[PDB]
DNA sequence: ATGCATGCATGCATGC
DNA sequence: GCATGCATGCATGCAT
């Protein structure tokens, strides 16, 4: 059906905002979203759900779509119990020091599950941790790590989120030493087990080595490979062409540019990633709107495209990750 | 058009000040400035803008120009959006320790986001961060780094600056171990992604070690090469001739000396970085004004030029930078062939 | 006036 | 041995 035609009478800002809000439900995304939703609907005794994808494949967008859907689902049940929390999600902070700071992570976890109805669980065993003089929670600096962890466990078991999201969980990987890496993921696992809360990890292929330090991790968790569209298969090429056609039909410009015929050039840079493709089209459309142009030329794509040096490194990284996603059976 | 002739009646300080304030809009600076402007106007999820080039090329001047232009643009809307700070800029501190110190960086970042009017941002952090009844937002020493970072992010998301400027970005390369370099920029990437604030990083080619730290970071970054003029192409030589003619016209003196004739020497001891040429000309003009001479001689230019060893070292660094920064259609075809059929 | 909350002063393990 | 950060120790202030 394309974009609404009346947007052409609107200023450039409105049209640009429209494009950003508009979403493409591509089939790989639908598959991954459905799988993740179904796995959320039934833990099956697995403490972790790992969603690893090539950068730009839609990971964070997927995570967001999941929170919206679960909030829509949980609002009717939230009617009854105000205290219960639907979903908690936060990005893992990359540490500036040698290793991951779990203390700051616990503080930000407590901040994330902050509830306006604080009167339900105003005391987690706190040394002045609860909010005061401001809406935001004021965690006491001198509180030791185990006490903060206990308070976080109490808050989790009180609110009981359906699933706990860690955005860009590749950061957990940073650690001071090769042998000390074994402890982080297992500590997170212990926290998940005691709380009983389903934890989900989203990140790049960097966590793949962090993923399978032993077979126990594979046994106790579920893998969701957010695969990109691969030019090797004509199926993925056709899907990519369909996505390009949808973007051509939905970008707010007077004349729809023929993006489809330049699919090879788009793949060259995007590498089958829809998010990178969407970002590139947003760049080009913003350029055109600021020029008040009428159509998109290949020069427009070239001007805001990623440098071929960037694409080379990106392709090497994703190809290495995909090859790593080939562990064989012990049979 | 030349300098205002009335300046000749003014003292030497005014004559020098006019030339110091004088600016040249040479084409490559305009191209880079336009690209940076357009990228800032649309972050498009990109987390980093890497602007790098040789020493003396115009990068800091660009940082000041974009700051002023964005402030001017946002002022009419700043008349309604009081809490906003359009552009904030800070210079990375070269650390005395073997590794960069993030604590001082965060403290100076908060200091950079300062408004004598406390009303716009009444609360900045947990404790030990509020101002001491003065405009300066002094930070208590015992405040640990993670809480400091949290306060910085809470201040940033409230002020919501369009772009965060980190000048002289090469100091981020100071680290104790090799692959810890990934983690050094990963921290800033996490800050940018959490705060939703686009970071522009400016520095020399020493920062090229950051260029492909990771595929994620490669996607998140945009490269803007501040090209210095290369004598191998007659186009750059023509542009350099135009710049030299403009400087010859605009320097205040009794007569305009023929700087154009000595373009070979100027390129020899400037490597085509117009900032160094401007600075050298300012030095020579200052010498002339101190002598109150009517004209610039080649001897004056020689008296305060750069040493041949310095020029050789600069060229040796620039050659490595450009070699790292080169791309050919053969590389594109090689990439395409790996992907599938290549055209 | 007596226990408790907090802020500053040692202190130590780390880090080198 | 200096430099660094967290932790606690001591001490004072508070307030009921
Ligand atoms: N299928 C999609 N439909 C609509 N918007 C999308 C889609 N995929 C990506 N986007 C847009 O792209 C951005 C999020 O892309 P995202 O999935 O986070 O890429 P990403 O690689 O996961 N981010 P990161 O991994 O940290 O570099 C948002 O602006 C989304 O609107
Ligand atoms: N385009 C320009 N127009 C006018 N003056 C310029 C220009 N570029 C540089 N300059 C002059 O060069 C000096 C600043 O150059 P600058 O951009 O700071 O070089 P720089 O390499 O960034 N300094 P640094 O990086 O610390 O070595 C000032 O004296 C400016 O007047
Ligand atoms: Mg993402
Ligand atoms: Mg400079």
Write the DSSP assignment of B193-225 as a string of letters. Answer: HHHT-EEEEEE-GGGGGGTTS-HHHHHHEEEEE
Among candidates A15, A52, A91, which has minimal Cα distance to A205?
A52
Write out chain B residues lying below 8 Å of A306, CB-based.
218-219, 222
The reply to whether residue B219 touches residue A276, judged by beta carbons under 8 angstroms, is yes
| Distance (Å, whole) CA B200 – CA A211 | 33
Write out chain B residues lying below 8 Å of A290, CB-based.
38, 41
Give the technique used to solve this structure.
cryo-EM
The 3-class SS string of B48-86 reads EEEEECCCCCCHHHHHHHHHHHHHHHHHHHHCCCCCCCC
| Distance (Å, whole) CA A60 – CA A275 | 10
The reply to whether residue A264 touches residue B343, judged by beta carbons under 8 angstroms, is yes
**CA A21 to each of CA A15, A58, A320, B306: distance values in angstroms, whole numbers, following the listed order:** 10, 14, 33, 55
| Distance (Å, whole) CA B275 – CA B24 | 10
Beta-sheet pairing, A48-53 with A221-226:
parallel
Q: Which residue ranges have their beta carbon within 6 Å of ligand 1?
A: A 20, 23-24, 26, 29, 55-56, 58-61, 168, 274-275, 278; B 45, 216, 219-220
What one-character DSSP code corresponds to residue A160? -
Residue appearing with tokens 């000040």: B17
Q: Which residues of chain A come before a gap where C and the next N are over 2.5 Å apart?
A: none
Q: Is A49 helix (H, G, I), strand (E, B) or coil?
A: strand
Residue appearing with tokens 């691969």: A230
The beta-carbon contacts of B119-123 under 8 Å, at least 24 apart in sequence, are: B120/B82, B120/B83, B121/B83, B121/B155, B121/B158, B121/B159, B123/A134
| Distance (Å, whole) CA A59 – CA A276 | 12
Among candidates A110, A69, A112, which has minimal Cα distance to A91?
A112
Q: How far is the CA of B36 from the C1' of C15 (A)?
A: 42
Resolution (A): 3.7
Q: Say how many Å lie between the CA of residue B200 and the centre of ligand 3.
A: 20
Q: What are phi and psi of B43, to 5 degrees?
A: -60, -40
Are A236 and A229 in contact, with CB atoms under 8 Å apart?
yes
Nucleotide lying nearest to A141, CA to C1' measure: D6
Please give the structure tokens belonging to residue A167.
Answer: 């955005």
Q: Whose CA is nearest the C1' atom of nucleotide D5? A: B144
**CA A155 to each of CA A81, A193, A272, B77, B82: distance values in angstroms, whole numbers, following the listed order:** 16, 15, 41, 42, 37
Among B19, B31, B60, B201, which is best to mutate for testing ligand 2, by the most ligand atoms less than 8 A from CB?
Answer: B60
The 3-class SS string of B146-199 reads HHHHHHHHHHHHHHCCCEEEEECHHHHHCCCCCCHHHHHHHHHHHHHHHHCCEE
Scan residues 173-192 of chain B and list those with Cβ within 7 Å of strand C: 176
| Secondary structure element (H or E) that encloses residue A326, with its range | none
Ligand at shortest distance from the CA of B239: 2
Scan residues 118-147 of chain A and list those with Cβ within 7 Å of strand C: 127-128
| Distance (Å, whole) CA B46 – CA A124 | 39
Question: How far is the alpha carbon of B212 from chain A, nearest alpha carbon, in Å?
Answer: 7
- Report angle CA A312, A59, A52 to the nearest 5 degrees: 75
């Amino acid at each position: 059906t394309g974009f609404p035609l009346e947007l052409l009478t609107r200023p450039a800002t409105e049209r640009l905002a429209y494009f950003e809000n508009y979403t493409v439900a591509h089939p790989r995304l639908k598959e991954v979203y459905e799988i993740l939703m179904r796995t959320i609907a039934e833990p099956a005794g697995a403490s972790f759900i790992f969603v690893y994808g090539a950068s730009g494949v839609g990971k964070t967008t997927l995570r967001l779509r999941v929170e919206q859907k679960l909030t829509e689902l949980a609002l009717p049940k939230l009617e009854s119990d105000r205290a219960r929390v639907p979903v908690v999600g936060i990005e893992a902070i990359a540490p500036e020091s040698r290793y991951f700071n779990w203390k700051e992570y616990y503080t930000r976890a407590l901040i994330t599950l902050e509830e306006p109805l604080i009167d339900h669980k105003f005391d987690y065993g706190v040394r002045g941790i609860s909010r005061d003089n401001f809406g935001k929670i004021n965690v006491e600096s001198k509180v030791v790590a185990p006490a903060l962890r206990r308070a976080l466990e109490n808050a989790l078991i009180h609110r009981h989120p359906d699933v706990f999201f860690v955005d860009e969980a590749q950061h957990f990987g940073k650690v001071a030493s090769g042998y000390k890496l074994q402890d982080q993921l297992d500590c997170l696992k212990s926290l998940a087990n005691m709380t009983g809360i389903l934890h989900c990890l989203l990140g790049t292929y960097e966590l793949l080595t962090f993923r399978n330090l032993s077979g126990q991790l594979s046994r106790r968790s579920v893998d969701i490979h957010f695969r990109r569209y691969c030019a090797d298969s004509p199926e993925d090429v056709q899907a990519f062409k369909s996505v390009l056609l949808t973007f051509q039909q939905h970008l707010p410009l007077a004349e729809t540019p023929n993006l489809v015929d330049h699919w090879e050039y788009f793949y060259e840079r995007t590498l089958g990633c829809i998010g990178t493709l969407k970002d590139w089209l947003k760049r080009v459309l913003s350029d055109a709107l600021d020029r008040e142009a009428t159509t998109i030329t290949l020069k427009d794509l070239q001007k805001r495209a990623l440098s071929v040096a960037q694409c080379q490194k990106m392709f090497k990284e994703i190809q290495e990750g995909e090859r790593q996603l080939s562990e064989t059976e012990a049979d």
